[model samples]
Target: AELATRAIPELTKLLNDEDQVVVNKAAVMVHQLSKKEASRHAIMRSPQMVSAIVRTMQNTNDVETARCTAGTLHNLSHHREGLLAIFKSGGIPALVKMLGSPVDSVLFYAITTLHNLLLHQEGAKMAVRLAGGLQKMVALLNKTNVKFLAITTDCLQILAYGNQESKLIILASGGPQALVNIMRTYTYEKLLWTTSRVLKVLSVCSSNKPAIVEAGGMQALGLHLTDPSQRLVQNCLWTLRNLSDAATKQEGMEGLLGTLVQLLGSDDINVVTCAAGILSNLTCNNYKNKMMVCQVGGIEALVRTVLRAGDREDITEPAICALRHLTSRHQEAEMAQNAVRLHYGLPVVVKLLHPPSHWPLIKATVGLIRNLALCPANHAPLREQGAIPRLVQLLVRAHQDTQRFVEGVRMEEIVEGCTGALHILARDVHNRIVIRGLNTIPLFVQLLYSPIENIQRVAAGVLCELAQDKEAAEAIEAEGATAPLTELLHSRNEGVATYAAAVLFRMS
Candidate 1:
């Protein structure tokens, strides 16, 4: 170590020697010495030594010098100062250029050295932005060397990390297909993890979805979703989430819902959360996948997860989102409601109706409860779980929430969520009796004067539902709703005018 440190001057000079032979020999010495941590520091302690090595990579015509310099840089690149020094002295282009080297050892060291450089953010950006650098790395997939594949794959993964344009660039370079091919053809565990990471990052681009699917990426990853390793499952599930738009059709599903349902039971919170999100995407606007989820008892599992999740929004939001998708349409509403009731999910659902709720969780919880209240069949469970008083209180709170959020948010989501849910719940005779008992006719009438058309229309509609009973009708009249009900007849919103006219027809 002392000798290597003492030789820093002579070696740095020899690295720039006039003869390529001298430079090559000096770089091999630097590479061999830098292998030790103490020796690496000794070399890195001299800025001239780092610059001479980067200069050799840049100026050397002999492949051996560049190859040896790449090995030296690879060893030095492990530390911050050497990597920064190399980057400052213009080493990126030489490393990128050597990726295309005809000599196998030169190319291997180049790729390996480049991979180490990418451990730094600047190196990642520089390597990725190098003209044709990413494409050449991707093209290396055709080579059969596992080290080549592993290094190139991992480097690509780093380049795509948090770089949106890099993701698009990778997509343009046939990255998804090449990665999928690597994953299918190779059984190397590290390669699988690294390649899965790349696909997961690239999967954010919508344009790459078809390519990923066409290359059988989804199938390969779906198979990985069941892997014993939680990390692999999490990565595979994340990739599947972005690719799930195509999973809407029945045949496209390929039993993935069953796979994800099993993950909801995972002890790892991240695994459970990712699985829930993928199921939400798979079920959104897709009836076939929803049915598959329901067939696998996903709702029961999802509710159980939420129960286990306590107040963690990461677990509840997507869990409720999947439930919201399941009940989005009328046909499956009863089935989903029955599943919630079976799992005793109403307590969690009811508890989620209050403050400190994530907007998504609130929207989804209100959406499912709206569907549940649609049929009298669900009223018993909703009431047994004490859904009435909390839902009534949400109407007032939702109106306040709407007024507080007029700047740039969805203005009346909670308002519409509450009124829409209440309108349906009031349809049941027992629920209306509870509504009249709460003196909620005033809240309904207050909402009828809301500026939001849906709020007015739905409040008038709920009043109409409550008006079926004589006692609630008199209470509605006592609350001075008749004037707004009369004024709403001139509303441009057809639903408002129609519901207003209906309420007048009923209450008058």
Candidate 2:
């Protein structure tokens, strides 16, 4: 309440006094006050208050007032509609254009303002660059110290994610080399996420390979696999994941996989989850990589980590996902027999893929199972153990899972995964009692008509089983499976069409 009281017009008046110290000090008070609805609203509605703050951004004589105003603007930009009062004021471009100026301290405040403006909306980037931000910023990168270079690197990165063309601009600008230098030489907050993201870009643009090679990026990347910082290690892990693509093959990943697995020994679940995910993606496409990953005890590390962090819903999702992906690709006869004997791998995933659980993990795990279940080697144990019955029951209600948490706002990977999981669960012609009990065929044949591709694939695969089941076939054909099957045949996806054909053949 006192804070609320201090932010009134009287206090803002105190900031206007002749003493610059008092003014700057009052400016600080105004910023803290801006956190309040009343104070922020006051700044928002009043042209005087907004203009004064904008003017402060330009004043070369007072650093404190400038700093406070810059901070306040960053916060204000978050509410984009409220920022219109400052629009015709012409201050945003001024702040960005100051990056090319002669005064170091003044230039610092300007760049800081640019950062705040960007933290809110894409319009701010346009405003900043329109005000001469990009040109000045690009020039500064060649001349700035590592500290300034770090800030410049981050701004470029934000721009990269924000626009496609800027990605190439950043690469052409030698952004990766500047960041690699900072990673080897300095330590700071946001160091890991920023540089990790920067490397992610470099990995995507093969043009970056020359710069990364010159900067000893490979050794530095592998080094972070052992770094004490959890975030740094995670980003380091992502950089390695990106590198594992065609460009990274130039750097050599021979022992990189084992070193990453060793980091799972640390208690930090974030580091473990990222390392596990990267290794999971790498191994997903190759049996050789899967064998190599399993040999390094990466699989055991992931399983143990997941078990230890079981209580954290946050970590549990990824931890379970890693196991699902890794084990799905290729499980050794010896490892499978040993894991079942010791109760690891498939038994553990089967344990997690259900009930009032964290649902996305269930989907990812189920997707892995659907793909893996194609091999008789993969499905035989579950056939004997009645895993199919439980999974069929889960699939009957699979649409209940939604992936609101994934990077995109749209498609529910979790539900899609459940569809795939249900596919694996319901596929076996031998599991007649369970298949009939769940009525899995008709349910999926209905969903195959839905817009989602993976769901269609899952439905198509299940159609193969039901098409073979005489009772289920009588049930589906009564509902008209032929139309959807024909339409799915016209699908642009080869996988979808192939599965659809399998369904048709099985049904006939």
Candidate 3:
């Protein structure tokens, strides 16, 4: 670290000297000095020093100085501040412009700097606007050498992430097709992972969807999963997951479900979680994928994973979300309910409902329970396992929170979730008695006036069921439901008016 500090004083003068040999030597010395962490700031903080290096990179006919200067910037880029410094000094566009260099070492160092510069979103935006940035980076992919090809592929990965404009820009520049070829050719772990990552980001853009599908990105990613390391598997799954949404219908989803099912049993929680997430997306509104997942025992595996998750919501959240998707439809819905019931997953999932639980966890859990409640077969087990009162409590919390006019709470979804769950829980007259015992009928009446249509609809349905008992009917009438019922009898929503009319009849 100390050697780097002492060397830069003389190197800065040499870099700015009239003598070419002295400037080349200074660039090399700067590159060597930047190898140490401490020397990075010494060179970076000095405007004269970095200015000389950037100047040398631009003017030096000597490839050696350009190499060293680019290499120095590459090493300096390990820190975020250095990237900002490079951007501030106009080094990003300069590096992107350097991609046209025919020299190997110069291209390597320049690509290295380009990769790190793209670590920041602003750097990525800046690179995208430069003339050669998108075009020249794609040009490098044609090189037969695997080493630089890997670096170039990684550079594209960082450039495409979370940037809508750049994603389409790369697509227009043939990045998806080039990346598909790289995934096919490179069997090396690092190259394979980097290439898959690029495809992953590309698959997420709705505009790039048709291009990636046509480029064979989806098919190539499935094949890439053949002999992947754990990390490589994670990347491949994410890539496939992103593509599965738009492209799965266009392509054959043959090996996808089987591989995902196998991954659920992986000892790595991350791999299992990622596999669950992919399955969740795949099965979302796609009943074919849901059946495929269930036929391969995916639902049972997901249930076991949740039962095993103990207290960690990170793993449980996605696993349960996948379970929600698997059970989204009625035919396969029973399969998932049976799996969860057999695995004793009902109580385990229900327990996540509480004050401090994340909204996602609650959403997924409520969604699963809502499905389970659809079948009368599930009610007994769930009710006996305490799902009945647990759901009522959630409704009470939603009511109390609404009464207080709580700030920032997802009261709409929460209140609807409680009513949705109550829709089934209130199916039995005995459960209706349990609900009225909680004094929740007035709360249900309050939701009848909610601005949200679905909340009002579901809250009306809950009342329709609860008012079946004459005593509960008295409670509903006592709470002033007749006014809303008379008004709602003219509601545009068929379900809301139907349930409101039924509740009014039962009350009479």
lDDT of each: 0.78, 0.62, 0.77
Q: Which candidate is the best by lDDT?
A: 1
TM-score of each: 0.78, 0.53, 0.71
Query: Order of all candidates by TM-score, from best down to worst?
Result: 1, 3, 2
lDDT of 2 by residue, 215-328 (tens): 667556775666666667677776765554433333344466688678666676666666665665556556666667667776677767667666564555665555555555
- Off-target runs (Cα >4 Å) in candidate 1 are 1-91, 101-105, 120-132, 162-165, 200-220, 238-251, 330-332, 354-360, 400-411, 477-483, 486-494
In TM-score terms, candidate 1 sits at 0.78
Which structure among the candidates has the greatest TM-score? 1
Q: Name the better of 1 and 2 by lDDT.
A: 1
lDDT per residue (tens digit) for residues 1-508 in model 3: 3654676676667668678787787788888777877888777666567776777787788777888888888887777777767776677667877888888888988877777676653745555456468778888888777778888887777766766877888888888888888877777777888888887788778877678777777667767655747667777877776676666465356577777788788888877777777777667777787778888888778888877776778788788888878776736777677777777777787787764567768777887888877767777777777776777777777666766723334766777887888887789767777777778888888889987878888989999988888878898999998999888889888888999999988987
Range of the 10 consecutive residues with the lowest summed lDDT in candidate 2: 402-411
User: Which wins on TM-score, candidate 1 or candidate 2?
Assistant: 1
lDDT score, candidate 1, position 389: 84
lDDT of 1 at 58: 78
Q: What is the lDDT of candidate 3?
A: 0.77
